[PDB]
Write a protein that binds this ligand. Sequence first.
Ligand SMILES: [Ca+2]
Ligand SMILES: [Ca+2]
Length: 294
Amino acid sequence: RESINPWILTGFTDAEGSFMLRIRNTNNRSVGYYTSLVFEITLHNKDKSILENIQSTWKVGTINNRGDGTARLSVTRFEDLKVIIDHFEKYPLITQKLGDYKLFKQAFSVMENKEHLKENGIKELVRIKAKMNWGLNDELKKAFPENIERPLINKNIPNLKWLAGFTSGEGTFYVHLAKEASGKVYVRLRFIIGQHIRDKNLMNSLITYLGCGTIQEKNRSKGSMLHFIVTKFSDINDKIIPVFQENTLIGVKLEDFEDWCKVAKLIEEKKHLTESGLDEIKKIKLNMNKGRVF
DNA sequence: CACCTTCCAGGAATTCTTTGGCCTGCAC
DNA sequence: GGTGCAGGCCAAAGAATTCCTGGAAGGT
Ligand SMILES: [Ca+2]
Ligand SMILES: [Ca+2]
């Protein structure tokens, strides 16, 4: 179906997706190496439509339906990769994934000269794979004793469309219920984004760019990880909800968000204290997030 | 028959979600 | 014979995501 806005695309890619450089020796007597370039996303079936719309937008890559209960989009056809690179040069990433993507681009240029089939090709492309992702496997580590640091990237959030894309990937909207013996049962709206410590910068940018929220480190559970949380109702209703209302989310999360706002209006109309409306809230919370059923 | 690329399917590691509960300090 | 609540904190678990790999089907 439909295609996606470019910045929504880049944002969602910062959240999910991987750029990978395969370097595998030849099963043939050829003492050489075959080098593959792959950009692939793997999601729960709920969001398969996204995988389509990405395809529909790039018109490259294949979409495989897995038995894992997930769906995967792969782009490895060499010339098709141009599309990808063309995109992320006109709409760059901002998370640490940018680093990996850049190495991707680098590798592509090395293979574009068709020199990868050359000894020089092998020498350079390994120097690249060592830097991106988990680096070299043990085999390539023994075959190529070499010297390979890595500084953190600190880019600024481009716009709100990027945020709607990214949040559609890694954001969360939670309705917290605490029900003293008063029996009342309190309601609270939380908007959470969980990131690895390496993306601390992004987190910081988040607060300033939204002008609200608070960062909770989470190290007594080793992930590492840390969270960006917004719960103050003034900020949720005056700062968060309008953002994602004018820059719509994508994927099932949108529906979640919508139900979220249902709760938010009820909490604004003060109808959350009456038990009937509180029942309405409970019903919504029960049928969203992990509770929704597709 | 051979190189090489593009694809699928599998899978282990781990990074997200998503989920709660506890605490505190104002207003009143 | 302070207390109710909103705005914060503390975290866990599994599963959705991150990466990688083996094997083989398409083009020359
Ligand atoms: Ca992710
Ligand atoms: Ca997600």
